[PDB]
Amino acid sequence: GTHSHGLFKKLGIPGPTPLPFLGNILSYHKGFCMFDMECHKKYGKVWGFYDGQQPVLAITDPDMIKTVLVKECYSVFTNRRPFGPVGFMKSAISIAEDEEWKRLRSLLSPTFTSGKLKEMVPIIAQYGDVLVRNLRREAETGKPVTLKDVFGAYSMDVITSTSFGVNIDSLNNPQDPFVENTKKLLRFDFLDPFFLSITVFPFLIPILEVLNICVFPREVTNFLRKSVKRMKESRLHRVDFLQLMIDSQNSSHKALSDLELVAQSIIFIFAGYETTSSVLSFIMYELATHPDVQQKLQEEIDAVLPNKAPPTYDTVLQMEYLDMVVNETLRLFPIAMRLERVCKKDVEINGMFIPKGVVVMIPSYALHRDPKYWTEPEKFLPERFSKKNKDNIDPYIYTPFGSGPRNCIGMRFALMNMKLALIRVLQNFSFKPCKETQIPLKLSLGGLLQPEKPVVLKVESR
Amino acid sequence: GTHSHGLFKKLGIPGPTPLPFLGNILSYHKGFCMFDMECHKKYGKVWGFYDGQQPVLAITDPDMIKTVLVKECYSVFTNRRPFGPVGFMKSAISIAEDEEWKRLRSLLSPTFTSGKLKEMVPIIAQYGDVLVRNLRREAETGKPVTLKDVFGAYSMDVITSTSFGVNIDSLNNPQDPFVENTKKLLRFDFLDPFFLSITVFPFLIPILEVLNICVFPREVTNFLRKSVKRMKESRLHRVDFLQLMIDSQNSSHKALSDLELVAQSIIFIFAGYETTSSVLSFIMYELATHPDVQQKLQEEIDAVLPNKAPPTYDTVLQMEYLDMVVNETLRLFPIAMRLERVCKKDVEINGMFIPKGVVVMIPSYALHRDPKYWTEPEKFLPERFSKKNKDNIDPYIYTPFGSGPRNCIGMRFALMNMKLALIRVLQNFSFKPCKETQIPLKLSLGGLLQPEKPVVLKVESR
Ligand code: HEM
Ligand code: HEM
Ligand SMILES: CCCCCc1cc(O)c2c(c1)OC(C)(C)[C@@H]1CCC(C)=C[C@@H]21
Ligand SMILES: CCCCCc1cc(O)c2c(c1)OC(C)(C)[C@@H]1CCC(C)=C[C@@H]21
């Protein structure tokens, strides 16, 4: 069962020896992050391994990364790895391939412009107030707070109102039928018993397709397909993603059909719910364990927003230290962990031959903690992103949102969404560690970049 | 189980109603040929059906056929339908796809030039003598001859000597180890219990790949892989396909590797063994049931080749009535039956939208027996291809070797190979029907264009 396990030895590329059928997946017992760091340590700039029979070439050269992600993106490295039975979510932009992706990425790009985002801040700002009033209930009761719930409700509060206009206090209505379905849209643990079996038996993916089995629960999508169906029939002015997409199909490319439009609204929740929630928990953990950084940030917030002034789009871009705190956290915790591109031709880039079918991988977690580009990479030093030192940062080493034409389309939204939370939250509360707080934080050995234990902290009102 | 069975009704294309999972394959109980004729009768110029879940759009417009096979061949309709677990025969030119095919088709095109073919006639001519001496043994014994064996041995006699230089009287040595393996390379009956299950369960193809199961018997290819391995080690001048390919890798494209070179030699046998043998049986059946055509051909042969003169390359191209007999037979019996191309993009050709993934099919058998282009299409009238009437023949209606960049690469060889047999055979023997001869001939209801019963005829010596 080693039809292709001799490839990296033929090309003369170092890497760990694979087992038959399994490849190197037994080395995932400590997570993707630990595996990438160690391979980078042993083998250096380029190494290869096997996800079962699938060869994966890892690369850490900034020139090589720019070629893969930007230069030869359209011509060679256009798609990501197929990951399992997807059904009608083939129409989602992150899942679509080749010209279908290029068309979708164009039909949805004006939806994520800064000008469209500025019109969305009054909707995002409203649920910072909901976020604060939910926090104040737990602050004057003295109970340590579990961030992933109060923040998980916030990330859901923003999605429902900016992606459909549904206004729900999901923390005090954690039980409305619309919240039940959308909360079942968590990010995928590719080290769970399922996707590991997908890696060993990729020939089983076409099987699950003909059985209508999907990695997106059919009930959730069936609920949202008819829910959007009823929303579009009711609207027959506002700044919500669904509206901008409805306006898109109301015209070079074919207009977004009805099923394609629903599939995008679903992938926006999938890419934004647990991601936004997890980064906001990582940031508050660092603000708690470094009170000096939390105070300096609170001083800057009140300096731009006197007397707890409500944050605007412009006053958010005005806060440089807040952007430093966010950027430094995303360096330590790049929740995607990896970037992947499927090589679709036989190409030679930067003096290295890469054959068709090989998955090229950029280990983001490993590069963000590389001592050869970062001084004391484990420490939380927001000054790395000061306007003085941000020039010395290579944009292909620090890729928390990826790079190139296939980078995070919701990057501006995700950063504004997180910053509006921190501003309103730090305007009202200080965050101090608890005896039950895991210090130092340990990561999950699974397939998602998340804390081993949920981050619990103390919340005091200023 | 009808995820895509609504496609042709959405596009408004007529066709037979499909059953869940099965599609229209139950209509194959009378063969592909009967199914194409009837659909052409009911629905007209364009219709659609389903091979399970796979939509197949049939087209019969000459302008549309030229677009599919020539104009938009490289850009859209480059590949044929995937057909089952293929293994290392992915490297065969007929199986390869996209740029890999374009590269192989270039590395092998100078191998099939007329100039290379002229140097192969002395090898092909030698086994016409072997073919005659095998026929003479059965002619003066009065036994009716089964053509598919005496001709099957001839088509194998030509392949072994022109593809490897192996000189075997496969009719009197039907038992050498080299003949045993190569005779297991028959054309595929896509209506047998296997490939019908492949059509219903295409998700099972990736399964059979990981089990090393291949539609080419592993023992045969393993025998030939090491046999060619020993042939190339022994050669370390002649006009054999293996030599021309060995010369190709002895240099814009990468040279043919060792496994690719073996895979081509195998696909040449697969495409040439039963095909050449079956056409030669169809021709002799028509020469037997139309003695007037057989006499006129024998008169032309002796007029170009006096006193049973051995046929040269030039004297073969000199015989126009022989070319008429061959062409008229290939019209009645286009052994490929169909041409197929997978639509790889969303394209609109000649005012008709065709979506990505649909297999476009050209029903050759049906078009060759279309009364709207042929007068009395069932009758064997070689005068249709007379130099006077051959101008009125549309090259996209009569496609026995296909058309466009992906047509039969061995067309010139196959025609010369068959004609050299008929010349030498008609120089020595006349062929008269037997009481056991099936008159009129009935075709096999299976998935191969072949007689229902083997053609048995009487052979008398002139
Ligand atoms: C903390 C928040 C987020 C982080 C860290 C993040 C990170 C990423 C990364 C690393 C990628 C892959 C880039 C690449 O492959 O080069 C990506 C893709 C993507 N993200 Fe985000 N993301 C976040 C939030 C969001 C949000 C709020 C949206 C809202 C729509 C979103 C939508 C997408 C989409 C659609 C893609 C795929 C784009 C394509 O394939 O063309 N993400 N994200
Ligand atoms: C009576 C003899 C033969 C007939 C009727 C025949 C017919 C055909 C047809 C209809 C096609 C497909 C064309 C298309 O898809 O448009 C084809 C393809 C092909 N044939 Fe033949 N063939 C014959 C003999 C041979 C021989 C002797 C060879 C020797 C090498 C050969 C090699 C091939 C190859 C390699 C292809 C695929 C080419 C490609 O995919 O680029 N065939 N043949
Ligand atoms: C087995 C092959 C794995 C590839 C599957 C895969 C991996 C992956 O990291 C992502 C996928 C999909 O979908 C999108 C929506 C792009 C996500 C956006 C946000 C982040 C943090 C993760 C992205
Ligand atoms: C289920 C999809 C069916 C496609 C498989 C398929 C169909 C087909 O008609 C042929 C295939 C392969 O291979 C080659 C070598 C091109 C053959 C050449 C000679 C003739 C008569 C048949 C050709």
Residue numbers in the entry:
A (entry chain A), B (entry chain A): 26 to 261, 267 to 281, 286 to 496
Reported in the publication:
Our spectral titrations showed that THC is a type I ligand that induces a blue shift in the Soret band of CYP3A4, leading to a nearly complete low-to-high spin transition. The X-ray structure was solved to 2.72 Å resolution and contains one THC molecule bound to the active site. THC approaches the heme with the cyclohexenyl ring (C-ring) of the tricyclic core at a 40° incline angle, whereas the aliphatic tail points toward the substrate channel. No significant structural reorganization is required to accommodate THC. One slight adjustment is observed in the I-helix, where two central residues, F304 and A305, shift away by 0.41 to 0.46 Å to allow THC to approach the catalytic center. The most notable change is in the R212 side chain, whose guanidine group moves up and orients parallel to the tricyclic moiety of THC, establishing cation–π interactions with the partially overlapping benzene (A-ring). The ligand-binding mode is further stabilized by multiple van der Waals contacts as well as long-range polar interactions formed by the A-ring hydroxyl group with the A370 carbonyl and R212 guanidine and by the pyran (B-ring) oxygen with the S119 hydroxyl (4.2–4.5 Å distance). The aliphatic tail is flexible and not well defined in the crystal structure. Importantly, the observed THC binding mode is productive and suitable for oxidation of the equally distant C7 and C8 atoms (4.1 Å from the heme iron), the preferable sites for CYP3A4-dependent metabolism. Thus, the long-range polar interactions with S119 and R212 assist but are not critical for the THC association, which seems to be mainly driven by hydrophobic interactions and steric complementarity with the active site.
